[PDB]
């Protein structure tokens, strides 16, 4: 997938081969599916939770005041979520660190984007994604075969931790 | 009859007990009670969905399998109607 | 380093087993001889954008749920 | 805009049944409106993927937008029915003439029936705080009457579109 980052369709024998190049290929693809197919909710739930716990962020003094600022924040949360989703697909954080995190703290410092709010938004997204992967719903209320995805959940948790460490 | 202007009531619920910000949108008689810190906002506005949003939602829907946590499953692979 | 073009990878997962009405013409590699012939991952790199409609609606939710203190 | 606060809000609460609980129930809908619409249109589609096939009614950004829009319009008029305690505005300004509009356009009835059904189930779960997410804090109690009332409003939508 390195080409597209720097449309790809991987199916058939290419997909068969791709699954033997990562650990737990099938469950990994299920986890990605859960995250990307719920992206708008994941993102808005994190940004609105950041705000509902610290309403000054949408006061006239707050960094999310105005539709244009709110849109930029929602966008960034989605950028982060997508690079985490790519790390889960690829099994490593190289592109996340290079293309999403390197230089971001300095950018936010120069813009005045607040660290506290960023950490809370990321933390809500982390908890949400971990819960989608460690989903213990009864089978009739679950889109995937029920089983243990705890290793994948820990892996995705670690990718969010790399985001938090870069922004703090 | 529907007006065909796609306008609907937008309701916002402000339960702002414990909020120190003073707002003056409501101009009526005071409650001298908790309702001085509570408000319902109602507007009638065109409901709008941008084609950017519609494209993004299509991409979220087009896998046809994933759902919210702990909800019923009705997905299929054939035309139903 | 971030490019400051706001572009991110968009992943789409197609578990299309049993689906017949879509022409599986996008993947042009060899067949697996297995269920992967009905399965496909798509990846594109896109500018991430948020419409004013979503920005306004998310704000509208927020304003409806600022946490009370008591 | 209309702002109902202070003594006007006390009057509103007295002029409907279970005023404070009713506002919690309304808030369970409007504070989740984008997720409710998403679940309904997405489930409509995953049940019948033909809706986004190259000839289906939700194909193209313009039509998808209109459908997402309509689900929200319907949802918001239901939320107003719950705020006010009756369906007169919903029937007059949202349902009257809508079935023939949809028939003229070819907007599929079974799709609307599925979307409305999901919206009803989702709202009832948020109102009763049995959804996975429970972000709105309420004092403990029984909201089954308000849940049944909103279920009635969605059923009038279904009845008008069926
Ligand atoms: C929206 C996507 C989603 C679907 C679909 C689903 O089924 N569950 C989903 C989301 C989800 N959210 C969490 C956790 C949190 N969400 C928030 C924000 C909301 N809480 C508020 O107080 C608030 C303003 C009024 C919100 C908006 C928060 C704060 C959390 C908790 C984060 C934490 O630190 O633990 C989850 C995780 C599972 C859970 O129930 O906590 C999920 C799956
Ligand atoms: C809005 C997201 C959300 C959060 C956050 C949360 O905590 N609950 C949420 C959603 C929610 N959904 C339902 C019920 C249904 N959703 C669907 C659609 C999905 N199922 C699919 O198969 C599919 C395509 C792959 C979907 C998308 C359906 C069919 C239902 C059931 C509808 C019915 O008529 O019963 C609920 C209600 C859950 C409950 O009743 O306990 C909630 C809260
Ligand atoms: C406390 C929750 C809070 C802190 C802390 C903070 O920094 N900002 C806070 C609240 C806040 N409120 C609003 C907007 C509105 N609040 C409203 C409530 C009332 N209006 C009234 O007249 C009364 C008395 C009966 C209320 C209880 C309303 C109606 C708001 C919307 C006004 C509008 O239509 O534009 C915000 C948003 C930003 C702002 O206007 O200050 C915030 C952040
Ligand atoms: C079955 C679920 C179905 C019915 C019934 C129906 O009416 N439409 C259905 C499916 C459907 N699929 C798509 C889009 C894509 N499907 C893809 C899957 C594969 N492509 C391949 O080459 C292979 C072989 C390995 C696949 C398993 C892909 C990649 C799709 C995206 C195409 C793109 O990006 O342009 C849709 C959307 C509309 C369409 O193109 O048919 C639908 C409705
Ligand atoms: C944690 C991630 C969740 C969970 C997952 C889980 N999935 C499986 C089994 C399968 N999942 C797939 C999915 C795909 N393979 C593909 O090629 C594609 C399209 C790109 C997808 C979506 C497949 C094919 C399987 C094999 C079974 C089948 O054919 O249906 C399991 C079972 C164990 C295993 O590894 O096979 C599990 C546990 N389950 C959960 O409960 C978590 C919420
Ligand atoms: C079902 C909906 C859930 C449930 C509700 C429930 N709420 C209360 C008490 C209150 N609810 C409110 C809410 C508001 N009042 C406002 O003015 C506004 C802003 C417009 C809101 C959001 C309030 C203030 C109260 C307290 C009232 C008081 O004077 O103390 C109850 C308690 C019973 C009652 O009738 O008051 C209940 C049961 N509870 C649940 O468990 C369901 C999930
Ligand atoms: C989505 C769940 C379903 C669906 C929706 C769909 N609707 C339209 C077009 C229109 N919808 C309306 C509805 C209203 N107008 C109003 O003023 C009100 C009350 C406030 C309502 C409820 C109207 C008037 C139109 C036509 C005009 C317009 O959109 O501006 C479309 C587009 C139809 C087309 O062919 O272009 C769609 C797709 N479609 C589905 O498949 C779902 C079942
Ligand atoms: C939301 C949780 C938080 C918040 C966000 C916020 N961000 C900006 C502005 C920018 N964000 C970026 C980020 C990136 N660009 C990239 O290319 C990538 C990697 C692919 C990332 C992560 C950049 C470059 C900017 C500035 C330039 C631009 O927007 O194109 C804003 C707007 C800041 C302003 O002053 O206008 C906001 C509001 N704000 C918050 O309060 C939350 C904590």
UniProtKB/TrEMBL annotation, chain B:
The modification 5-hydroxylysine is found at residue 4. It is found in: Plastid, Chloroplast thylakoid membrane. GO terms for cellular component: chloroplast thylakoid membrane; phycobilisome. Its main location: plastid. It comes from the Eukaryota. Keywords: Bile pigment, Chloroplast, Chromophore, Electron transport, Membrane, Photosynthesis, Plastid, Signal, Thylakoid, Transport. It is a peripheral membrane protein. Residues 7-63 form the Phycoerythrin alpha chain domain. One of its GO terms (biological process) is photosynthesis. Coiled coil: none annotated. The keyword Electron transport applies. The keyword NADP does not apply. Heterotetramer of 2 different alpha chains and 2 identical beta chains which form 2 alpha-beta heterodimers within the heterotetramer. Belongs to the phycoerythrin family. Light-harvesting photosynthetic tetrapyrrole chromophore-protein from the phycobiliprotein complex. This is Phycoerythrin alpha subunit L1. It comes from Chroomonas sp. M1627. The gene is cpeAL1. The chain holds residues 49 to 129 of 129 of the full protein.
UniProtKB/TrEMBL annotation, chain C:
The modification 5-hydroxylysine is found at residue 4. One of its GO terms (cellular component) is phycobilisome. Its main location: plastid. (2R,3E)-phycocyanobilin binds at residues 4-6. One of its GO terms (biological process) is photosynthesis. Residues 7-64 form the Phycoerythrin alpha chain domain. This is Phycoerythrin alpha subunit S1. It comes from Chroomonas sp. M1627. The lineage of its organism: Eukaryota, Cryptophyceae, Pyrenomonadales, Chroomonadaceae, Chroomonas. The gene is cpeAS1. The chain holds residues 53 to 122 of 122 of the full protein.
From TrEMBL, chain D:
(2R,3E)-phycocyanobilin 2 binds at residues 57, 62, 67-73. It is found in: Membrane. Coiled coil: none annotated. Signal peptide: none annotated. Its main location: membrane. The modification N4-methylasparagine is found at residue 57. It is a peripheral membrane protein. (2R,3E)-phycocyanobilin 1 binds at residues 13, 20, 24, 139, 141, 143. GO terms for cellular component: phycobilisome. SUPFAM superfamilies: Globin-like (SSF46458). Gene3D superfamilies: Phycocyanins (1.10.490.20). CDD domains: PE_beta-like (cd14767). One of its GO terms (biological process) is photosynthesis. The keyword Plastid applies. Keywords: Bile pigment, Chromophore, Plastid. It holds the Pfam family Phycobilisome. (2R,3E)-phycocyanobilin 3 binds at residues 57, 63, 67, 69-70. Belongs to the phycobiliprotein family. This is Phycoerythrin beta subunit.
């Amino acid at each position: 997938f390195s080409r597209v980052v720097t449309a790809a369709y991987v199916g058939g024998a290419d997909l068969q081969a791709l699954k033997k190049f990562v650990s737990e290929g099938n469950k990994r693809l299920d986890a990605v599916n859960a995250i990307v197919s719920n992206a708008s909710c994941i993102v808005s739930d994190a940004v609105s939770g950041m705000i509902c716990e610290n309403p000054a962020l949408i006061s006239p003094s707050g960094n999310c005041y105005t539709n244009r600022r709110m849109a930029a924040c929602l966008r960034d949360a989605e950028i982060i979520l997508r690079y985490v989703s790519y790390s889960l697909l690829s099994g490593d954080s190289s592109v996340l660190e290079d293309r999403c995190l390197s230089g971001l703290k300095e950018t936010y410092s120069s813009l005045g984007v607040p660290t506290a709010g960023n950490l809370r938004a990321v933390g809500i997204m982390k908890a949400t994604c971990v819960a989608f992967i460690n989903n213990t719903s009864q089978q009739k209320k679950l889109s995937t075969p029920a089983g243990d995805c705890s290793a994948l959940a820990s892996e995705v948790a670690g990718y969010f931790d790399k985001v938090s460490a870069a922004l703090a | 009859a529907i007006k065909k202007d796609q306008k609907a009531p937008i309701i916002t619920i402000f339960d702002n007990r414990g909020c120190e910000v003073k707002k003056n949108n409501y101009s009526g008689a005071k409650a001298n009670g908790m309702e001085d810190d509570q408000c319902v906002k109602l507007t009638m506005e065109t409901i709008t969905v941008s084609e950017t949003t519609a494209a993004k939602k299509l991409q979220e829907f087009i896998g046809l399998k994933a759902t919210a946590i702990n909800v019923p499953q009705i997905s299929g692979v054939t035309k139903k109607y | 380093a971030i490019k400051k073009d706001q572009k991110a990878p968009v992943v789409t997962i197609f578990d299309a087993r049993g689906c017949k009405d879509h022409s599986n013409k996008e993947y042009t590699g060899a067949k697996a001889g297995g269920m992967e012939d009905d399965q496909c991952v798509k990846l594109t790199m896109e500018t991430i954008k948020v419409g004013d409609d979503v920005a306004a609606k998310v704000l509208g939710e927020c304003l409806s749920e600022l946490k009370s203190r008591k």
